[PDB]
Ligand binder design. Sequence first.
Ligand SMILES: [Zn+2]
Length: 136
Amino acid sequence: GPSDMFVHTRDAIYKCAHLTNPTDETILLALTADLQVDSTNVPGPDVIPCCDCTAGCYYSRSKDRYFPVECVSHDWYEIQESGYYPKHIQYNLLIGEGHCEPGDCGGKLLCKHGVIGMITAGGDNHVAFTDLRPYS
Ligand SMILES: [Zn+2]
């Protein structure tokens, strides 16, 4: 569960858009958030809180462990060119100090109340999460 690179709530599945494709169960697609949301008939264990938290813990796939992390909100952020996207702007980010490598996208960010984010980009001791709360 903690290692899953997606968020699975009672009614929906949240994935990083570049890691999937639109399907007939897609209910939200936002490339400005690198986010795809699909409806699902099978209930999931995760909960997206309506809290205000910016601090918690996240899964790092490259290190294969969880890290504590403290984040700051950014309305928008410049993501550098990768392999799936050109250099572009993304919206609603949480940014914290922490390790991040290519391949870590989708790793969950949790506060006490539930999952609030997913790794979407990161670099030199910075990790960027899309805040899922605006989109739930
Ligand atoms: Zn919280």
